[PDB]
Amino acid sequence: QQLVESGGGVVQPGRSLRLSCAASGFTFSSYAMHWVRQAPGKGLEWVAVISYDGSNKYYADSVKGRFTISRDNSKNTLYLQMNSLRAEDTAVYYCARHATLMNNKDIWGQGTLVTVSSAS
Amino acid sequence: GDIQLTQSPSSLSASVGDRVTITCRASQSISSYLNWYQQKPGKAPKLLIYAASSLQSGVPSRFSGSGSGTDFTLTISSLQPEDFATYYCQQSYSTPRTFGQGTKVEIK
Amino acid sequence: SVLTQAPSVSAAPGQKVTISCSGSSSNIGNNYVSWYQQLPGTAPKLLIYDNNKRPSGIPDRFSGSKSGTSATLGITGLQTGDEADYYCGTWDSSLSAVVFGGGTKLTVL
Amino acid sequence: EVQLLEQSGAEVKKPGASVRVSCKVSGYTLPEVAMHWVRQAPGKGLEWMGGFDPEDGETMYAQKFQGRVTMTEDTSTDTAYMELSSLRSEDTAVYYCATTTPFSSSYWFDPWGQGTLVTV
Amino acid sequence: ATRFASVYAWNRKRISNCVADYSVLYNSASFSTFKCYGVSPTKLNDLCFTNVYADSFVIRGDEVRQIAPGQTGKIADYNYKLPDDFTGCVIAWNSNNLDSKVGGNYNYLYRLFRKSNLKPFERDISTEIYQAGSTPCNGVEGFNCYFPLQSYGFQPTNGVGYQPYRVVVLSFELLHAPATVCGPKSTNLVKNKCVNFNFNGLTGTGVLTESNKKFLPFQQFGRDIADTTDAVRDPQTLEILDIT
Amino acid sequence: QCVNLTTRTQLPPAYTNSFTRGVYYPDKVFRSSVLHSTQDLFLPFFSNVTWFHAIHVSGTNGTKRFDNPVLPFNDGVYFASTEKSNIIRGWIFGTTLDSKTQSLLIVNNATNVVIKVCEFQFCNDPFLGVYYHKNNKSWMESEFRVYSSANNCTFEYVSQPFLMDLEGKQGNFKNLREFVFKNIDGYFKIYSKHTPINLVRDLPQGFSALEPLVDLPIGINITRFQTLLALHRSYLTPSGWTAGAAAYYVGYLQPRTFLLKYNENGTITDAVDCALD
Ligand SMILES: *[C@@H]1O[C@H](CO)[C@@H](O[C@@H]2O[C@H](CO)[C@@H](O)[C@H](O)[C@H]2NC(C)=O)[C@H](O)[C@H]1NC(C)=O
Ligand SMILES: *[C@@H]1O[C@H](CO)[C@@H](O)[C@H](O)[C@H]1NC(C)=O
């Protein structure tokens, strides 16, 4: 039913910041989950998947920074660590789901700002 | 390579009661795997059509999808004062997924 | 705060001198008294509780007394490492809370 | 007997903020023993704060500071949060986590808390 | 029960070592589709069972005819499979006043596809992606591959054919194991009459009377010098009954 | 949890002699003033019984000795205790005293004893911790100071407390409490009794009849066990543990033929072993 996100903030470039997003209402477990990016004034750009029902991780090669994705399924939560930062990634992120002709499960988080800059 | 999307027009300033056709074109032949979203700027993207030809709960038939292959169509009809926002198409054919650049329907 | 003791006191090493704290019947009169020690930028350590009970690890050389509204903290066998501030406290029913004095920083001469 | 966890850590919050203080324990469980709080300003004395009442079973709040600071408890994780609000001039200081016994008056506190400064 | 799961993860309850209340099953009479097998439903009141499997789920009001031992259709194809030789009863009724909610019921689910027909009585909770075409999707969704599961759409705005049934299925067997679950018979006590009897499995024939000999509570029998069963206590109403 | 304090102590197990003891009713059948004879597991008379101490102060100051060993079940088990102030609750009966087997966990947590037959993880020094909640001013019992994991559980049951006090008696009773544990034929049956005793420690010459409490489907072989304890926390004095003193009696059962003399009311007094002499 509901998705909550870890806190965004201002991080210096080259660093790492783990992204937590917990589910509620129905589990993460039976589904997949995604991350997308929205820069201000820019379109929604897909980032990376997670696939718990086997195990596989796909990343966008457009932003191929080894932003690692894995689970905490028993907390219905998902972790993607912001690795190899660069300033144009300063944006808001969303926890996502795609209706793949079968489901209607597209549920979106509230959105938190990741900021990549040396100036706080 | 990647699959390119082509969302046209990328904006359309509109009026009350219109019937706007927001087109999302595709670089490949995608079966029906395309969606549509409502986003007022700052909101969560509320899904509108799934599989490019099927309505959604809470969203009446003032929105109406059709198309296949390369050509996909957002059939907005009887344009309502709440429907003026920034919208999006969506592939789910391959990996990577890309989304359209958005189409802001806004009051003339 | 609401209690009475001096900012500082000094004495020669190895000597015997104590420190007292003057309360009222509303605070010390019906209530038990405690005493605390802190070194600069450190953890304030319980010295004596009830004026007759030593916590575990306290030298027996410390004693205490309560005479009316006055409570003295027995301090004997001064050491070079005994220089620090000692704090009196006792339960307060007035504001129904915990109260302390300003503290008295000992100096071993 | 018992050693405790720290009170906060280092919490530095510029004016226009407010800070919780989460004091955990070890060797005991949280709700077998009552916590307490004392303001200590450097170069100054003790000012008692927060606290639990052995009588009446309430968690006390220092009348002078009452309403500005609140306390909650998670019994299993031993996390007791002390939230001070509305930063002012003289209220940046070390606030000690202390613990007397609910069974008796026990004005005597736990052997020591390690202390945490705050920021205004 | 207050909460039946769907058919992709149907609940199963092994039941034995108790007694069957088969009377009010027929006296319920609020049940839409209530059929049985093995031998007649009136006959099954006493003809009893070693070990029963009570498994229940919720399906649609149209697809329930798929539930029949040895048929086809989605629920019996990929969701829940009655065997080729079956004994038990299919009990089916509507729960439209509970399940289907305004604002939409989408708690319930089912599996729509799998790469084979389903083995009998085996659930399928594996929600991984099936790849219909040859293009490997490998856990994430994609092209030629779909998601496995789908919901139902339940509201009270549905017609009568689209109403949710809480189908509970009772399945039975017979083994070297004894009839651990078995229906009746409390028999009214007869005083001073030559009467065959059974108490708690103890059997004999005697004249049962009121008797003043006084047991200790945990006890069951009395006995005489000769290792006969002299006096027994009525289990249903504790009383000391001689046996002559 | 699994907080542990072995505190191992030396000295020989202090033995004793059960004079007439451990005679239960091995049937429900009511009999009156007859001599009945069966050969069954019992604790034979004039037997060696180990007066063990779970907590033992030998005075200098304090010096509480926690000795209670894991003990084999052997054929059958007898148990006896006084414990005016209860410190004893239940027993850990099992085989591995671990997972891989079931576990018989008797907890007489006040007041609803929740017998448990499950698969647990029993710690190296298991016992029930008791503390003070501060919420509702109630002494809870931390049950995972006994065992870490509770899962897989096969059986569960609840009854009225077997352990029971009376007190107000400033002694002169000691409330001597006996429990017999016999594991056979899928039924592990529990027996009990409550008796006044004025003697300082050891047992009198009287007969103790034990009724079966519950006959339960257990189906496990129990080859070893240990008792359980109730301890608490104290606060600053020159943590607190080992509430009061604790000692009990244990002896092993054995097949023997007893002649059983029922009374007019079926209360067995005189029992006689055949093989005794
Ligand atoms: C009772 O439990 C014990 C395990 O403690 C089992 O006895 C073991 O039997 C094997 C032979 O199969 C011996 O090698 C072991 O030494 C025995 N254990 C001990 C501790 O001596 C036994 O299987 C169980 N009871 C039954 C009826 O199977
Ligand atoms: C019991 O122990 C005593 C020693 O205390 C010994 O003399 C005696 O032989 C033992 N008897 C039995 C039956 O164990």
Among candidates F233, F236, F239 on the partner chain, residue whose Cβ is nearest the Cβ of D108: F236
β-bridge pairing F224-225 and F254-261: unpaired
E204 in reach of chain B (CB within 8 A): no
Number of domains in chain B: 1
Distance CA E142, CA D44 (A): 67
Among candidates A46, A106, A108 on the partner chain, residue whose Cβ is nearest the Cβ of B99: A46
- Torsion-angle region of C103 (φ positive above 0: left; ψ -120 to 50: alpha; else: beta): left
Do residues D11 and D19 lie in contact, with contact meaning Cβ atoms separated by under 8 Å? Answer: yes
Residue B60 CB coordination number (10 Å): 11
Cα dihedral F188/F190/F191/F197 (nearest 10): 130
Distance CA F193, CA F163 (A): 9
For the record, the structure tokens of E50 come out as 């070693």
Residue F16 CB coordination number (10 Å): 17
In B68-107, the residues whose Cβ lies within 8 Å of chain E are 92-95
Per-residue exposure over F116-148, b if at least 16 CB sit within 10 Å of its own CB, e if not: bbbbbbbbebbbbbbbbebeeeeebbebbbbbe
CA–centroid distance, residue F21 to ligand 2 (Å) = 17
β-bridge pairing B34-39 and B5-8: unpaired
Distance CA D90, CA D15 (A): 12
Cα dihedral E195/E196/E199/E203 (nearest 10): 140
Q: List CB contacts (< 8 A) between E242 and chain F.
A: none
Q: List CB contacts (< 8 A) between B31 and chain E.
A: 143
Atom 14 of ligand 2 has which residue's CA nearest to it? F48
Order the strands of the E231-233 sheet from edge to edge.
E194-199, E202-210, E240-243, E231-233
Distance CA E232, CA E239 (A): 8
DSSP-assigned letters across all residues of E198-232: EETTEEEEEEEEE------TT--BB--TTS---EE
Chain D interface, mutation test: which of F138, F234, F235, most D Cβ atoms within 10 Å?
F235
| Domain harbouring A112, CATH code | 2.60.40.10
Q: Residue E229: name the closest of E194, E196, E205, E193 by CA.
A: E205
What lies within 8 Å, CB to CB, of E112 at 6+ separation is A102, E74, E78, E146, E148, E149, E150
What lies within 8 Å, CB to CB, of D65 at 6+ separation is D39, D49
| Domain harbouring B80, CATH code | 2.60.40.10
Q: Residue A63: name the closest of A88, A30, A99, A27 by CA.
A: A88
For the record, the structure tokens of C95 come out as 């504001």
Q: Identify the closest residue of chain A to E9 by CA–CA distance.
A: A30
What lies within 8 Å, CB to CB, of D12 at 6+ separation is D119
CA–centroid distance, residue F156 to ligand 1 (Å) = 25
Burial of C1 (0-12, 13-18, 19+ CB in 10 A): middle
Q: List CB contacts (< 8 A) between D98 and chain F.
A: none
Do residues E143 and B94 lie in contact, with contact meaning Cβ atoms separated by under 8 Å? Answer: yes
CA–centroid distance, residue F259 to ligand 2 (Å) = 25
Distance CA E211, CA E233 (A): 10
CA–centroid distance, residue C33 to ligand 2 (Å) = 60
Strand partners, F35: F261
CA B45 to chain CA mean position, Å: 11
| CB-based touch A/B (3+ pairs, under 8 A) | yes
Q: Identify the closest residue of chain E to A34 by CA–CA distance.
A: E140
Distance CA F217, CA F207 (A): 29
CA E215 to chain CA mean position, Å: 39
Lookup result for tokens 């305004």: E102
The dihedral of CA A95, A101, A105, A106: what is its sign? positive
Single-letter amino acid, residue C2 = V
Atom 8 of ligand 2 has which residue's CA nearest to it? F48
Contact D112 C103 (CB under 8 A): no
A27 in reach of chain E (CB within 8 A): no
Backbone φ and ψ for C27, nearest 5 degrees, come out as -125, -70
The dihedral of CA F210, F214, F219, F221: what is its sign? negative
Q: Residue F234: name the closest of D33, A69, D30 by CA.
A: D33
Length of chain D counted residue by residue:
120
Do residues F231 and F127 lie in contact, with contact meaning Cβ atoms separated by under 8 Å? Answer: yes
Give the helix/strand (H/E) hosting F182: strand F176-184
Distance CA A2, CA A22 (A): 8
Do residues B94 and B100 lie in contact, with contact meaning Cβ atoms separated by under 8 Å? Answer: no
- Torsion-angle region of B52 (φ positive above 0: left; ψ -120 to 50: alpha; else: beta): left
Give the helix/strand (H/E) hosting E27: helix E22-28
Distance CA D99, CA B104 (A): 60
> Coil, strand or helix: which one is C74?
strand
Subunits adjacent to chain A (3 or more Cβ pairs under 8 Å): B, E
Q: Identify the closest residue of chain B to E138 by CA–CA distance.
A: B95
What lies within 8 Å, CB to CB, of D92 at 6+ separation is D117, D118, D119, D120
Distance CA D22, CA D11 (A): 11
Distance CA E105, CA E154 (A): 5
For the record, the structure tokens of F111 come out as 């007041």
Atom 12 of ligand 2 has which residue's CA nearest to it? F48
Distance CA A44, CA C75 (A): 73
Backbone φ and ψ for E89, nearest 5 degrees, come out as -110, 145
Do residues C98 and C36 lie in contact, with contact meaning Cβ atoms separated by under 8 Å? Answer: no
> Coil, strand or helix: which one is D32?
helix
Q: Residue F218: name the closest of F135, F157, F144, F161 by CA.
A: F157
> Coil, strand or helix: which one is C29?
helix
Contacts 24+ apart (CB under 8 A), F93-97: F93/F181, F93/F222, F93/F225, F94/F122, F94/F220, F94/F222, F94/F224, F94/F225, F95/F220, F95/F221, F95/F222, F95/F223, F95/F224, F97/F70, F97/F122, F97/F224, F97/F225, F97/F226
Q: List CB contacts (< 8 A) between E141 and chain B.
A: 92
B28 in reach of chain E (CB within 8 A): no
Distance CA E136, CA E132 (A): 9
Contact F134 D1 (CB under 8 A): no
Contact F30 E219 (CB under 8 A): yes
Contact A102 E147 (CB under 8 A): yes
Backbone φ and ψ for E26, nearest 5 degrees, come out as -85, -30
What lies within 8 Å, CB to CB, of B59 at 6+ separation is B46, B48
Q: Residue F16: name the closest of F210, F201, F192 by CA.
A: F201
Experimental method: cryo-EM
Domain span at residue A108? Answer: 2-116
For the record, the structure tokens of C60 come out as 């027996």
Domains of chain D are 3-117 (2.60.40.10)
Distance CA E234, CA E215 (A): 12
Pocket lining: F15 vs ligand 2, CB cutoff 6 Å: yes
Lookup result for tokens 């820069």: A39
CA distance E152 to chain B (A): 13
CA–centroid distance, residue F43 to ligand 1 (Å) = 23
Domain C8-108 CATH superfamily: Immunoglobulins (2.60.40.10)
Length of chain E counted residue by residue:
244
Number of domains in chain A: 1
Distance CA E124, CA A62 (A): 38
Domain F15-277 sits in CATH at 2.60.120.960
Distance CA C37, CA C45 (A): 5
Distance CA E26, CA E229 (A): 40
Burial of A35 (0-12, 13-18, 19+ CB in 10 A): buried
* C-alpha to C-alpha distances, A90 to A42, A58, A108, A114, E186, nearest whole angstrom: 11, 21, 19, 6, 79
Contact E221 F25 (CB under 8 A): no
Do residues B86 and B104 lie in contact, with contact meaning Cβ atoms separated by under 8 Å? Answer: yes
Q: Identify the closest residue of chain B to A60 by CA–CA distance.
A: B96
Backbone φ and ψ for E161, nearest 5 degrees, come out as -80, -15
Three-class HEC string of E161-180 = HHCCEEEEEEECCCCCCCCC
Residue F171 CB coordination number (10 Å): 12
Single-letter amino acid, residue C3 = L
What lies within 8 Å, CB to CB, of E204 at 6+ separation is E197, E229, E243
F139 in reach of chain D (CB within 8 A): no
Three-class HEC string of A43-104 = CEEEEEEEECCCCECCECCCCCCCCEEEEEHHHCEEEEEECCCCHHHCEEEEEECCCCCCCC
Q: Identify the closest residue of chain F to D30 by CA–CA distance.
A: F133
Residue E118 CB coordination number (10 Å): 17
- Domain boundary assignment for chain F: 15-277
Three-class HEC string of B41-64 = CCCCCEEEEECCCECECCECCCEE
**Residue E184, preceding bond cis, omega within 30 degrees?**
no
Distance CA E93, CA E77 (A): 21
Instruction: Tell me E66's DSSP state.
Output: T
Pocket lining: F17 vs ligand 2, CB cutoff 6 Å: no
Mutating to test ligand 2, I would choose from F45, F48, F51 the residue with most ligand atoms within 8 A of its C-beta, which is F48
Ligand 1 atom closest to Cα of F95?
5
- CA-based radius of gyration for chain C: 13
The dihedral of CA F95, F98, F103, F104: what is its sign? positive
Chain E interface, mutation test: which of F24, F27, F29, F154, most E Cβ atoms within 10 Å?
F29
Atom 2 of ligand 2 has which residue's CA nearest to it? F48
Do residues D114 and D7 lie in contact, with contact meaning Cβ atoms separated by under 8 Å? Answer: yes
Backbone φ and ψ for A114, nearest 5 degrees, come out as -90, 135
> Coil, strand or helix: which one is E65?
helix
Residue C67 CB coordination number (10 Å): 9
Pocket lining: F46 vs ligand 2, CB cutoff 6 Å: no
Among candidates F29, F213, F267 on the partner chain, residue whose Cβ is nearest the Cβ of E222: F29
Do residues F51 and F16 lie in contact, with contact meaning Cβ atoms separated by under 8 Å? Answer: yes
What lies within 8 Å, CB to CB, of E239 at 6+ separation is E210, E233
β-bridge pairing F187-192 and F176-184: antiparallel
* E strands, F218-253, in order: 224-225, 227-231, 246-252
Q: List CB contacts (< 8 A) between A43 and chain B.
A: 88, 99-102
Ligand 2 atom closest to Cα of F47?
13
Any idea what the Cα angle at residue F188 is, between residues F185 and F189, rounded to 5°? 120
Give the helix/strand (H/E) hosting C97: strand C97-100
* C-alpha to C-alpha distances, E8 to E4, E59, E80, E148, nearest whole angstrom: 12, 10, 8, 10
Do residues E128 and E148 lie in contact, with contact meaning Cβ atoms separated by under 8 Å? Answer: yes
Pocket lining: F223 vs ligand 1, CB cutoff 6 Å: yes
What lies within 8 Å, CB to CB, of C18 at 6+ separation is C72, C73, C74, C75, C76
Distance CA D69, CA D20 (A): 9
Distance CA A114, CA F247 (A): 65
Any idea what the Cα angle at residue D94 is, between residues C64 and D71, rounded to 5°? 95
Residue E157 CB coordination number (10 Å): 10
Do residues F133 and F222 lie in contact, with contact meaning Cβ atoms separated by under 8 Å? Answer: no
Ligand 2 atom closest to Cα of F46?
13
Distance CA E18, CA E183 (A): 8
Resolution (A): 3.5
Query: Where are the alpha helices (H) located in B1-108, listed in sequence order?
Result: none
Give the helix/strand (H/E) hosting E145: strand E145-146
Q: Residue B21: name the closest of B59, B100, B72, B76 by CA.
A: B76
Do residues E166 and E152 lie in contact, with contact meaning Cβ atoms separated by under 8 Å? Answer: no
Contacts 24+ apart (CB under 8 A), E203-208: E204/E229, E204/E243, E206/E242, E206/E243, E206/E244, E207/E242, E207/E243, E207/E244, E208/E241, E208/E242, E208/E243
Q: Residue F9: name the closest of F56, F42, F45, F46 by CA.
A: F56
Q: Residue C73: name the closest of C92, C54, C94 by CA.
A: C54
Strand partners, F159: F113
Instruction: Tell me B105's DSSP state.
Output: E
Q: Identify the closest residue of chain A to B35 by CA–CA distance.
A: A99
Residue F75: nearest ligand to its CA? Answer: 1
